[PDB]
Amino acid sequence: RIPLQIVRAETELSAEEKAFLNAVEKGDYATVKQALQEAEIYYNVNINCMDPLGRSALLIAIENENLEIMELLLNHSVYVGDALLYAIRKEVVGAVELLLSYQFSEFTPDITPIMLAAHTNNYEIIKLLVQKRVTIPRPHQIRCNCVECVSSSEVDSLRHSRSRLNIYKALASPSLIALSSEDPILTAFRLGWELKELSKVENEFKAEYEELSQQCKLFAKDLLDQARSSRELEIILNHRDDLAKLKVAIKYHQKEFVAQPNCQQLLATLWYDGFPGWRRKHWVVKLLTCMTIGFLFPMLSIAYLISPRSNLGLFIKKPFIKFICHTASYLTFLFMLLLASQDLHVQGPPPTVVEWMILPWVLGFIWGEIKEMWDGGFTEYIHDWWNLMDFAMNSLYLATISLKIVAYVKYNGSRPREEWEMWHPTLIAEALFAISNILSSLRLISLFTANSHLGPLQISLGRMLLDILKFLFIYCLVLLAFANGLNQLYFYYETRAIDEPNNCKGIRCEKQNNAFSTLFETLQSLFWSVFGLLNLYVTNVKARHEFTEFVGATMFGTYNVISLVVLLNMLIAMMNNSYQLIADHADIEWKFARTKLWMSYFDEGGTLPPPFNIISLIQNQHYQEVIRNLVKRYVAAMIRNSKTHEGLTEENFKELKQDISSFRY
Amino acid sequence: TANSHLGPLQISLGRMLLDILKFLFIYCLVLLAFANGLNQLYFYYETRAIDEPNNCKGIRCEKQNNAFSTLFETLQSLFWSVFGLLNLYVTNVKARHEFTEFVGATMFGTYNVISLVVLLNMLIAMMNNSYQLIADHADIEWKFARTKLWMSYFDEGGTLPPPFNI
Amino acid sequence: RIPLQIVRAETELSAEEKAFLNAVEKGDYATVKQALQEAEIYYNVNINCMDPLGRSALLIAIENENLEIMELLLNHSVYVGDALLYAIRKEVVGAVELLLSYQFSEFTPDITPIMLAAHTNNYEIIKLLVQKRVTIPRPHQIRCNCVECVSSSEVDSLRHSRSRLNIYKALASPSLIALSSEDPILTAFRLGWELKELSKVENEFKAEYEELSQQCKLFAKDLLDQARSSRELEIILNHRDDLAKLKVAIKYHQKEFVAQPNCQQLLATLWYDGFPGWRRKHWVVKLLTCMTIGFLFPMLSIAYLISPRSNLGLFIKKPFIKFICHTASYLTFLFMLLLASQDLHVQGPPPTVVEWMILPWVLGFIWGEIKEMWDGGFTEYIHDWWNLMDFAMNSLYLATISLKIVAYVKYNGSRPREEWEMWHPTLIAEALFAISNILSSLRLISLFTANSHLGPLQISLGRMLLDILKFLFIYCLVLLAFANGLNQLYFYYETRAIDEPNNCKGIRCEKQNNAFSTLFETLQSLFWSVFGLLNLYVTNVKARHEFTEFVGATMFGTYNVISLVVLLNMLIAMMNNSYQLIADHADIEWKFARTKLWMSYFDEGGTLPPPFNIISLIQNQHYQEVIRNLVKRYVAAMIRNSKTHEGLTEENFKELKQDISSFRY
Amino acid sequence: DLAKLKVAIKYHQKEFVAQPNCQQLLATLWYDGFPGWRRKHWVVKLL
Ligand SMILES: CC(C)CCC[C@@H](C)[C@H]1CC[C@H]2[C@@H]3CC=C4C[C@@H](OC(=O)CCC(=O)O)CC[C@]4(C)[C@H]3CC[C@]12C
Ligand SMILES: CC(C)CCC[C@@H](C)[C@H]1CC[C@H]2[C@@H]3CC=C4C[C@@H](OC(=O)CCC(=O)O)CC[C@]4(C)[C@H]3CC[C@]12C
Ligand SMILES: CC(C)CCC[C@@H](C)[C@H]1CC[C@H]2[C@@H]3CC=C4C[C@@H](OC(=O)CCC(=O)O)CC[C@]4(C)[C@H]3CC[C@]12C
Ligand SMILES: [Ca+2]
Ligand SMILES: [Ca+2]
Ligand SMILES: [Zn+2]
Ligand SMILES: [Zn+2]
């Protein structure tokens, strides 16, 4: 039999001090007033009593929303501590104003009235509080090591983290940004960037910072949405302190802001400068004009080089024409590379005509690469992740040219490749040239972002590469373990290449042998076993060691099972789970990428294609006026969205009943 | 588990091992049935290792022979048939028993279809369905595992590493 | 400029006839009464006027729910047509009773007040209407070809279908089953079965019938849920007109009813008859007792056969012991079959000891099969879909025995198999025996339903077999097309087996040749190409017909692409989509299957394992009382669930305000 | 120390264990020697 009792006992009640609490709970004004005045005359009661549910007279008045009992209690000199915070958090303007005009608490001691107003995001009460000179502390830099920060973290770290989070949550309020801010858009950009940076440093508190950054981005997008004229749109997008604001938004990774329909329409208008009917055109005529502009790229380049100011001179300044010319030049370079492969008995031959034509394009590519790193900088150069492939290709081409010139200078004989050594400079140069051709042909993937059908697909594939890289580590660990074991088992029976039928050793021969004799060959065999290109008799020895053969076969079968049946199927499940979430924002990611690609062609520098490449207060006032108009529209819209819900409004009957009762009285 | 990027993945792989173990039973039953049938059919034509071209008997030789002569060899051949490392002429006899050869080929094809087209695809669907639900609590499971691993080093005992421990 | 006007013009209004409509809309009793009496005295108004929104005075009174204006209008002799239906459909009891006591319509002409009450499913109004002698028409049998049905469908088919659907929807009401039904559970079973059958016949109207059947099943399950004693539960499950109701529910496919926790607990209690602490036992001791009971199956069978009434005689009557004994007998038979494979130079040898022991088990299996078809019937025998495999295995065994006896009678020599013919009875018998062994070993899958971990998996695999069968048709069509094409192309260059290096023709040789010479070989090669067991040089000819070789290679590559890259990946997507929906009801399906398997062992017949097999108004009154109690509980619970929502009830202020105003007056 | 945490780990209270405050305290105890490990570069951490 479980003796149910009270373990933590509170104080007793049911005196006159509880009588007048329950009178206040009833709320009848006359009875409350008479009981309170009688108790005050008697001078034997207090006002510190607490109900079992955790509410007092003032808290119950807060919950019931009765201004008459509110003013009566406040004029009766009841306790006032935290009552302003409770009223602000209850979100009633009349009692907030009344309390402003004049133990156990569910409020953190660091909470300020302005902080709570910012947390609750109420425009009216926020303005009412901010009309007085109220301020907010500064949280220190992200990696501050100053004595004040180290000391405060040492005495109490949980309170410090909570205070920082509360300060940032109050600062990231859309209303508190609408007021007391000269540039709300820039403020939102910087705040979102700072919160995104803070999320990584504060590992335990990540979701809160991420949601604050998302809220800032959404506020910026909603503020942009209210523009209702092309003049206002261009003023906003061109304000600086062209398209400086758009460049800043691209830098700060504001994909929702960038992918706005109005901004995209303006960008398309700027992009299709030469053609004004490109929107209303047939696919056949678009294709025909595409070839007819791409075919005359050398003529256009020569015309611009000769006469920069002419009818044909300025025809290449348009971004679309420049993009078409660059694409045609790259396609011509790739065609030359393909034609190159279509006497081989000389040692270090002079370059042929195809290589002579290929060299100016390669030199131009390198020149264009260095200028962009000099103009952009190291961080911008490495952020693209395509410049890595560009640098690798250019370095490989430079090494190929150097090796070819070295071979030409050194060797001058005529000997067969069957007698040439394995480390010949000519052979090294051909291998590097083949790798360079592979990389250059693979470089064409970056042009898929300009298309409507392939951009999101390419963006989705790029996102999944990360999961591929993550699984590669586990696969490599398993492969290393099994290769170590197999080599340790099989390294005893190594045989020389002379004893083999065709003087061939390894797995790249018809007589596959010595598959696990060395660690490198074991790694190669275990890699090739995934695709089923390794035979089954490689796990055999010339001697009759049936136990050893069976153990090796068991190891091989276990590795095959683990690699193919379990790990490969698990990768597939991860790809599906990742792509399900990836497919949601494909449009936004593709539009951001296409905007970056489009703006990459707006600059005046580098107009020519690679082969020929080698050879101020009025604006502030206008922006302020437009920002004021947008803020007013946004405030109205968000007030309405707050009014969209709770459609079953009340107290209209109470107000009318009070009025008619007074008239009857 | 000590890393932020690999912990949930390892935890997810560990959770799926159970479904792997559950499917292994059905696969083993099917394999045992088909191996019993194939051995019962083919055990009549066993040949000695002397008559073989290289004195090699079994499936681990270039001349793959006697694949279904014994139950153990039948099990090994049916296991290796999943990865396509078993040839097609193993279902042949020196005599001209075309009916027996056709029946053996039909059994082999039925086993291949059942094992590869139906059971392997069904495992994949189960892995997706399990991982969908698994991915929800990956953070909680990884944090619990990392907390256990961290608290495994708080005790005073065993401070020294293994070579100096003895 | 789009001239917006009225295309379909109604009648004019705004006379006194509209004045008194808007007076009724206002609802002030005194003004409405005085206006109506003045208009009646004037004798110049009507009551047929209609508002632009499609409502009249009575309809607006229905919507506003004002009993005083209701009785005033009804006593003023307004039009009454369809008003009862509008009130019943508005679901207000006071005005329904008032209207019962005394053009354009949104109601189908076939709608009856009782039909609408059944559609709306209101217990109170349904009872109020049914207290009078009201009835419902009969819809005819599913495939009725009678003149009345053919004539009514000929004059108007849409109206006929609508009338049938409305009649069935009214009949399938849970409240209309609670009233006016002696056996609500049996009525719900039959109604659900009939609606499920109707869904297939009425192809256009499927979702409605399916949802009606689901509603009937849910009502039956909810009615069963209210049982609150073991006595009531067993009375319900044993009522007949043992476990007759459970057998009927299993026959009618009531998986939700069967999988109830109370029914499952009772079934488990009946199943674990011998062991009362089986729930609280260790896995090790459960396993130990499982082997210790399965090992003594022949001793237990012999003891039961000798002394049916003894301590050991009745130990096999328990269902769990019987199941264990049968499983052990089948495992022993499979072990004997395995041992069988472990002189071969004789023609038609006599059977060996292993076959002599195997024959009694095979004869017992056949005897047990025929008895079950004789006892069950053709439909029950073919519904299991395991009896098909049982029949195939038994027929194969019979054919093997017949062929063996024929060979023994006919052939008596000693000739080598290398000289035996290809159609030898001995070889045919061995092939049939191998196929029988495969089938018998595959029969063990059906025992997975008794386990908690494998049942849902087996059930899920069984559900997906249907999608496998559906995809097989498309695959077969593609294979037939490509095989026809390849054979037509390649049949010109057929070569004889003598010219081949090893006198081997076909794809089952080392020298793979004549892969597409015949249609059968083309089919076999295209089948084996899926697993990559067909080489690439089979698409070659001895002559130098490079064009023909290239065309054949192109056909082969196209077939490979279509079969492997497109069709195989599409099957996977279908399996995932099907399994997502399949995984929801796995528990219910597994519990239904396990209940069927458990009840398969409750009968007295066939107690012995296969080798030894060859050698009445008080109950009605109690059921009626229990059904009445369950109906009362269900009605209370569903009334409360109707009261669970709309928690913001009203008209309490209106009633109190009316009362205090009358007291003040 | 951390007897209640040990009991919670024994009783498989993963939600209780994965609380942000408990994780912060555990990280503080784990990174005893280095107090600026949170604010450090990947290169210097690796070094
Ligand atoms: C995977 C292939 C390339 C074989 C490599 C074998 C070893 C060199 C690897 C395998 C697993 C690795 C470990 C995996 C994870 C960790 C935890 C990691 O912990 C942290 O990073 C703690 C700091 C933090 O992330 O907050 C420190 C390195 C270490 C021990 C790694 C050290 C290097 C190991 C032993
Ligand atoms: C799968 C491979 C390794 C071949 C093994 C063949 C047989 C030895 C297996 C195949 C299916 C097995 C059966 C699958 C499921 C069950 C139900 C199982 O029932 C229970 O556990 C009841 C108690 C409970 O779980 O509440 C008893 C064992 C049995 C008959 C198993 C006995 C052993 C069987 C016949
Ligand atoms: C798929 C493999 C086995 C090759 C078989 C080739 C033909 C014999 C098949 C391929 C497509 C079949 C057709 C697919 C679908 C239909 C529609 C089908 O229409 C109905 O069933 C109408 C009645 C109804 O379902 O309400 C009549 C048979 C027909 C023409 C089939 C006739 C037989 C066809 C031509
Ligand atoms: Ca670049
Ligand atoms: Ca049966
Ligand atoms: Zn500081
Ligand atoms: Zn009829």
PDB file of C-alpha atoms in Angstrom, chain B residues 22 26 29 33 36-37 39-41 43-45 63 71 86 88-89 91-92 95 97 99 101-102 105 107-109 112-113 116 121-122 125-126 128-129, chain C residues 337-338 341-342 344 417-418 422 427-428 430-431 433-435 437-438 441 445 448 453 457 461 464 508 510 520 524 527-528 531 533 571-572 576 579-580:
ATOM      1  CA  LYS B  22      17.492 -10.857 -40.454  1.00  0.00           C
ATOM      2  CA  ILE B  26      16.048 -16.339 -45.654  1.00  0.00           C
ATOM      3  CA  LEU B  29      17.377 -21.242 -46.403  1.00  0.00           C
ATOM      4  CA  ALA B  33      17.370 -25.804 -50.679  1.00  0.00           C
ATOM      5  CA  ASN B  36      20.505 -29.852 -51.884  1.00  0.00           C
ATOM      6  CA  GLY B  37      18.643 -30.126 -55.182  1.00  0.00           C
ATOM      7  CA  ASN B  39      23.872 -31.939 -55.440  1.00  0.00           C
ATOM      8  CA  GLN B  40      21.172 -34.620 -55.600  1.00  0.00           C
ATOM      9  CA  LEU B  41      20.979 -34.134 -59.365  1.00  0.00           C
ATOM     10  CA  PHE B  43      26.397 -36.209 -57.651  1.00  0.00           C
ATOM     11  CA  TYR B  44      26.309 -39.160 -60.090  1.00  0.00           C
ATOM     12  CA  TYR B  45      29.089 -37.891 -62.394  1.00  0.00           C
ATOM     13  CA  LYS B  63      39.268 -25.781 -65.618  1.00  0.00           C
ATOM     14  CA  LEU B  71      27.537 -30.744 -51.019  1.00  0.00           C
ATOM     15  CA  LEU B  86      31.179 -19.011 -61.700  1.00  0.00           C
ATOM     16  CA  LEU B  88      28.366 -21.404 -67.389  1.00  0.00           C
ATOM     17  CA  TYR B  89      29.968 -24.637 -68.641  1.00  0.00           C
ATOM     18  CA  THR B  91      26.541 -27.382 -65.775  1.00  0.00           C
ATOM     19  CA  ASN B  92      27.812 -29.970 -68.259  1.00  0.00           C
ATOM     20  CA  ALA B  95      28.261 -37.939 -71.393  1.00  0.00           C
ATOM     21  CA  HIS B  97      22.745 -36.383 -71.254  1.00  0.00           C
ATOM     22  CA  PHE B  99      17.985 -33.701 -70.605  1.00  0.00           C
ATOM     23  CA  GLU B 101      22.138 -30.779 -68.606  1.00  0.00           C
ATOM     24  CA  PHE B 102      19.000 -28.777 -69.428  1.00  0.00           C
ATOM     25  CA  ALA B 105      20.771 -25.285 -66.285  1.00  0.00           C
ATOM     26  CA  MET B 107      17.784 -25.045 -61.741  1.00  0.00           C
ATOM     27  CA  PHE B 108      20.837 -22.777 -61.941  1.00  0.00           C
ATOM     28  CA  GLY B 109      18.896 -20.075 -63.780  1.00  0.00           C
ATOM     29  CA  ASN B 112      20.176 -16.966 -60.069  1.00  0.00           C
ATOM     30  CA  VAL B 113      16.879 -15.180 -60.740  1.00  0.00           C
ATOM     31  CA  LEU B 116      19.756 -11.631 -57.683  1.00  0.00           C
ATOM     32  CA  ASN B 121      16.301  -5.751 -54.704  1.00  0.00           C
ATOM     33  CA  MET B 122      14.055  -6.498 -51.657  1.00  0.00           C
ATOM     34  CA  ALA B 125      13.966  -1.458 -50.175  1.00  0.00           C
ATOM     35  CA  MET B 126      14.280  -2.579 -46.552  1.00  0.00           C
ATOM     36  CA  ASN B 128      15.807   2.589 -47.447  1.00  0.00           C
ATOM     37  CA  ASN B 129      12.734   2.107 -45.252  1.00  0.00           C
TER      38      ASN B 129
ATOM     39  CA  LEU C 337      16.293 -36.566 -48.091  1.00  0.00           C
ATOM     40  CA  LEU C 338      19.686 -34.916 -47.552  1.00  0.00           C
ATOM     41  CA  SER C 341      22.143 -37.884 -51.919  1.00  0.00           C
ATOM     42  CA  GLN C 342      25.311 -38.749 -49.972  1.00  0.00           C
ATOM     43  CA  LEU C 344      25.355 -46.480 -60.281  1.00  0.00           C
ATOM     44  CA  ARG C 417      25.333 -43.963 -68.674  1.00  0.00           C
ATOM     45  CA  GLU C 418      27.684 -42.738 -71.410  1.00  0.00           C
ATOM     46  CA  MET C 422      18.838 -39.145 -73.359  1.00  0.00           C
ATOM     47  CA  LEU C 427      17.392 -40.246 -65.805  1.00  0.00           C
ATOM     48  CA  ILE C 428      13.878 -38.783 -65.901  1.00  0.00           C
ATOM     49  CA  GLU C 430      16.421 -38.703 -61.021  1.00  0.00           C
ATOM     50  CA  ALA C 431      15.568 -35.294 -62.501  1.00  0.00           C
ATOM     51  CA  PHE C 433      13.489 -36.508 -57.679  1.00  0.00           C
ATOM     52  CA  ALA C 434      15.872 -33.538 -57.655  1.00  0.00           C
ATOM     53  CA  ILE C 435      13.018 -31.140 -58.453  1.00  0.00           C
ATOM     54  CA  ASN C 437      13.811 -32.286 -53.240  1.00  0.00           C
ATOM     55  CA  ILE C 438      14.065 -28.603 -54.181  1.00  0.00           C
ATOM     56  CA  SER C 441      13.168 -27.995 -48.999  1.00  0.00           C
ATOM     57  CA  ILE C 445       9.193 -21.067 -45.552  1.00  0.00           C
ATOM     58  CA  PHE C 448       8.249 -18.383 -40.387  1.00  0.00           C
ATOM     59  CA  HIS C 453      10.788 -11.399 -36.156  1.00  0.00           C
ATOM     60  CA  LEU C 457       9.107  -9.855 -43.348  1.00  0.00           C
ATOM     61  CA  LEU C 461       7.878 -10.389 -49.357  1.00  0.00           C
ATOM     62  CA  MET C 464       5.707  -7.730 -53.286  1.00  0.00           C
ATOM     63  CA  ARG C 508      27.033 -23.914 -72.350  1.00  0.00           C
ATOM     64  CA  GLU C 510      33.866 -23.040 -73.490  1.00  0.00           C
ATOM     65  CA  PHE C 520      15.427 -21.258 -78.343  1.00  0.00           C
ATOM     66  CA  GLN C 524      18.534 -18.643 -73.590  1.00  0.00           C
ATOM     67  CA  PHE C 527      18.196 -14.564 -70.577  1.00  0.00           C
ATOM     68  CA  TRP C 528      21.786 -15.317 -69.551  1.00  0.00           C
ATOM     69  CA  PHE C 531      23.777 -11.803 -65.343  1.00  0.00           C
ATOM     70  CA  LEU C 533      27.487 -14.843 -68.295  1.00  0.00           C
ATOM     71  CA  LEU C 571      11.699  -2.270 -60.661  1.00  0.00           C
ATOM     72  CA  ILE C 572      13.704  -0.995 -57.656  1.00  0.00           C
ATOM     73  CA  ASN C 576      10.472   1.011 -52.577  1.00  0.00           C
ATOM     74  CA  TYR C 579       7.131  -1.359 -49.403  1.00  0.00           C
ATOM     75  CA  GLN C 580       6.620   2.168 -47.995  1.00  0.00           C
TER      76      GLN C 580
END
